[PDB]
Amino acid sequence: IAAHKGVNQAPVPLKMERVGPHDVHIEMTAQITDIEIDKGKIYKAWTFNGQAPGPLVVVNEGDTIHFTLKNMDPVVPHSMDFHAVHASPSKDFIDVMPNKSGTFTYPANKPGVFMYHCGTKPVLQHIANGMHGVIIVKPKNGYPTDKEVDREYVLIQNEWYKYNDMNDFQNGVPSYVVFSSKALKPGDPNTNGDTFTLKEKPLLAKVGEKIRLYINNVGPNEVSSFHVVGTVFDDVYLDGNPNNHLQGMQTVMLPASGGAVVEFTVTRPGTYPIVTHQFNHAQKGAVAMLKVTE
Amino acid sequence: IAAHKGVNQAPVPLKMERVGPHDVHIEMTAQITDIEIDKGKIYKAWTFNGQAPGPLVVVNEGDTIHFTLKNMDPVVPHSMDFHAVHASPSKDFIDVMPNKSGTFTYPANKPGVFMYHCGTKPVLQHIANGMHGVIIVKPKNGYPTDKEVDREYVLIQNEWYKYNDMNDFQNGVPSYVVFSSKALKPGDPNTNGDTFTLKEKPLLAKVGEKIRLYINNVGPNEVSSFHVVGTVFDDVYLDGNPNNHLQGMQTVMLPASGGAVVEFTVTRPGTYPIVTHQFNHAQKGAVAMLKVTE
Amino acid sequence: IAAHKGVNQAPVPLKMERVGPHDVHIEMTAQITDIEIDKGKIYKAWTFNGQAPGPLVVVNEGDTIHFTLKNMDPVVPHSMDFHAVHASPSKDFIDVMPNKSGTFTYPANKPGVFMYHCGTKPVLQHIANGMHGVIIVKPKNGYPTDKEVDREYVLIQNEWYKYNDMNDFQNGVPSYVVFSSKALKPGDPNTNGDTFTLKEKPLLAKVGEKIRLYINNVGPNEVSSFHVVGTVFDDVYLDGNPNNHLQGMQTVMLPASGGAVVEFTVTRPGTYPIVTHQFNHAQKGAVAMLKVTE
Ligand SMILES: [Cu+2]
Ligand SMILES: [Cu+2]
Ligand SMILES: [Cu+2]
Ligand SMILES: [Cu+2]
Ligand SMILES: [Cu+2]
Ligand SMILES: [Cu+2]
Ligand SMILES: [Cu+2]
Ligand SMILES: [Cu+2]
Ligand SMILES: [Cu+2]
Ligand SMILES: [Cu+2]
Ligand SMILES: [Cu+2]
Ligand SMILES: [Cu+2]
Ligand SMILES: [Cu+2]
């Protein structure tokens, strides 16, 4: 794309504010931003807000979202599909033209860990170039195990392919498969999907803690076999719905776009790798680290 | 196959009749039939009854099936394996020679949404060429959410490869991944697995309705990440067994041959895409449409 | 690897003994051993104890494992990661150098069917070359269906690639996908992952029996769609945890490293194939047989 040559739009902060007991405003951008996905490898990503995956959104069950997308891409239209919401896709997930904005309103009635992504045709191209992310909807009555949790983080898995190559997107193996972490509280790391950041700067915890991870595999194409080395998941809630409760799982399978809330205890000091156990993907980048100290 | 050159056997209707309170007769054919799997692309499919996937079969829990296969293929033997039944594979799923018939009897004791397919060696070749389908076994006591359902449809996902190419079947990516719909009531569409029919002629519903889909991924090779754009699944029954109940899932993972009953509400008028969220497969055809009107 | 040329170390028996009501000693080797993975095809595997997958380990819920690895490989370091245990990976899953031994201690608190494997970097290389296996942890209170089970076996699925070829391990399709069986009681077969042994020498059962299979898909890379032809799973316990109970499943999806306990009835005499229903993998070897006699 000639109009993207030389373009590197600086990241713009997510804007969110509550406007009523059950209403929240969210404003995002669509923008073109260089991201280092592996050491020495820059991908000129199509992004929300200059992050890939995009910024974390958190709302409460029952919130209506008033969402605005400002399209900063000079030539390509973009859109937004939140898996959390009930909406008419042909009226509410529609394209915003370059240099324009669009506003859409829809309710988030269901708790869980949902994917969001651009919905512009061809959707594979927009997702693969980086237009994906997670929205968490907090359950009204929490999770049954809330009282046991000592620390929590968000992890997202995605793939990267050859740059803007539709043949590779459709028919090729991923070049990289990566984790990123998105901040829930001040001080938490907030990273892009790359092969190295969560190895060099591990997530942190204390010996004996029960950790909760909110996880989602945004794809675009692969399923995930999510596993924390050195522990077993005490509790798993599929898609983050409190009713979908499994216990004692070694590994949690996630479809493309699938999410979960997983909880586990770290019993001894050391560094605990976090992987997809499809080890071709782990070898291509999908290993994060959790450093546990006394 | 020289004996298949020029062969295009017209579709034959499925024959079924109840012969007792718990006994049903089913008669199918194995036949060679040209199917348009993508615009301008004809596949000379190996089929049951001239449809790929084959015709829908529906029985009640506890029915014994008296099944006859008439093999119209001039050279290749064919057989039938129903996942619904308890049977001896080496006596009951055996080959029927060209121009012959065979009759087999076995019970369907378990409710759900089951794959059926030809069981002739090499099974990969017979499935990939089109010999797959779905049998639904209705639960004796229904599903707990029956009273909420306003409309229902059946969807099946399958792949297509290079024509009768065993190397591609074993080692290659699918050329197309497709949905088809099979009729439950008069007026419902009944389609083959192709990239376009359910886009051009969407399934129909009314605003506010709760929709039930009976779904199965027949493969042969891929898993599915089933998702309806613009909604969340209120209830999911894995393999269609009423006990395997999940709630509030954004996306339902299906193994190869796996089925489910999923239910969701459409809240606003518009067109709702239905996808596998493995977007390489969606790009290669696996998008259907649901048109919701006021 | 020049130091592996001509090396074929004879299999060494697993050593295990109980040393207290809740403590068990286990001693394994890491060794280089030629295995016939397909007719006429020898793979010089990296193994535990000269088997690939490695020997079966069975312990009770709540046992602490005192594990010793003796590394017989002349040049490559090796290690052990048990998915069953809570451990510090950076202190307890560490490398043992050639011709040395290491001892590690950790508890197995959770019931189920867990993968074990070498944890030496790059882990993909060590798993793909054969360093994988299963440990079963028996639940304190059993499974709710124990009284119904007449016979039980263990099955493991794995892949084989081009010999020690990291590009193929990361980017290629498997050359073979295979089942193996590991003995639970005297007289049970104990086999390696190959394309033929469980076809030529099927597992055995009697008409009318309820069979339990302990299953795990060790990968390294693929997910599994586990199915027994001619039956339906009466009960399924995901990861072998008694709480994760599904009923009436035709096919059980397993992530890479995922396990299950599955139970089904064989109603008629004959031979029942056992497959992954991803039929490209079945065609490449992943079909076992169960012979049922009167
Ligand atoms: Cu507003
Ligand atoms: Cu876009
Ligand atoms: Cu989506
Ligand atoms: Cu704690
Ligand atoms: Cu009859
Ligand atoms: Cu056939
Ligand atoms: Cu089958
Ligand atoms: Cu209604
Ligand atoms: Cu000891
Ligand atoms: Cu090793
Ligand atoms: Cu592991
Ligand atoms: Cu019995
Ligand atoms: Cu799955």
Coordinates of N, CA, C and O and ligand atoms in Angstrom, one line a residue, chain A residues 227-230 250-251 275 277 279, chain C residues 81-83 93 115-119 123 127 256-257, ligand 11:
Chain A
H227 N -0.9 -23.7 28.8 CA -0.4 -24.5 29.9 C 0.6 -23.6 30.6 O 1.5 -22.9 30.0
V228 N 0.6 -23.7 32.0 CA 1.6 -23.0 32.8 C 2.5 -24.1 33.4 O 2.0 -25.1 34.1
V229 N 3.8 -24.1 33.1 CA 4.8 -25.1 33.5 C 4.9 -25.1 35.0 O 5.1 -24.0 35.6
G230 N 4.9 -26.2 35.6 CA 5.1 -26.4 37.1 C 3.9 -26.2 37.9 O 4.0 -26.2 39.2
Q250 N -4.7 -29.7 33.3 CA -3.3 -29.4 33.0 C -3.1 -28.4 31.9 O -2.2 -27.5 32.0
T251 N -4.0 -28.4 31.0 CA -3.9 -27.6 29.8 C -5.3 -27.3 29.3 O -6.2 -28.1 29.5
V275 N 3.1 -21.3 28.2 CA 3.2 -21.7 26.8 C 1.9 -22.0 26.2 O 0.9 -22.3 26.9
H277 N 1.1 -25.4 24.3 CA 1.7 -26.7 24.3 C 1.8 -27.3 22.9 O 2.3 -28.4 22.7
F279 N 3.9 -27.2 20.4 CA 5.3 -26.7 20.6 C 5.9 -26.1 19.3 O 6.9 -25.3 19.5
Chain C
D81 N 9.9 -32.9 33.0 CA 8.8 -32.1 33.4 C 7.6 -33.0 33.5 O 7.2 -33.6 32.5
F82 N 7.1 -33.2 34.7 CA 5.8 -33.9 35.0 C 4.7 -32.9 35.1 O 4.7 -32.1 36.0
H83 N 3.7 -33.0 34.2 CA 2.5 -32.1 34.3 C 1.7 -32.4 35.6 O 0.9 -31.5 36.0
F93 N 13.0 -28.8 37.3 CA 12.9 -29.4 36.0 C 14.2 -29.1 35.2 O 14.2 -28.8 34.0
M115 N 0.6 -35.5 30.9 CA 1.8 -35.7 30.1 C 3.1 -35.5 31.0 O 3.1 -34.7 31.9
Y116 N 4.1 -36.2 30.6 CA 5.5 -35.8 31.1 C 6.4 -35.7 29.8 O 6.1 -36.3 28.8
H117 N 7.4 -35.0 29.9 CA 8.3 -34.8 28.8 C 9.6 -34.2 29.3 O 9.7 -33.6 30.3
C118 N 10.7 -34.3 28.4 CA 11.9 -33.6 28.6 C 11.7 -32.1 28.5 O 10.9 -31.6 27.6
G119 N 12.3 -31.3 29.4 CA 12.1 -29.8 29.4 C 13.4 -29.1 29.0 O 13.5 -27.9 29.3
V123 N 12.6 -27.2 23.6 CA 11.8 -28.2 24.1 C 11.1 -29.0 22.9 O 11.0 -30.2 22.9
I127 N 10.9 -33.1 22.6 CA 9.7 -33.8 22.5 C 9.5 -34.5 21.2 O 9.2 -35.7 21.1
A256 N -2.9 -30.3 22.6 CA -1.6 -30.9 22.8 C -1.3 -30.9 24.3 O -1.4 -29.9 24.9
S257 N -0.9 -32.1 24.8 CA -0.7 -32.5 26.2 C -1.9 -32.8 26.9 O -1.9 -33.2 28.1
Ligands
CU11 CU 4.7 -29.7 29.2

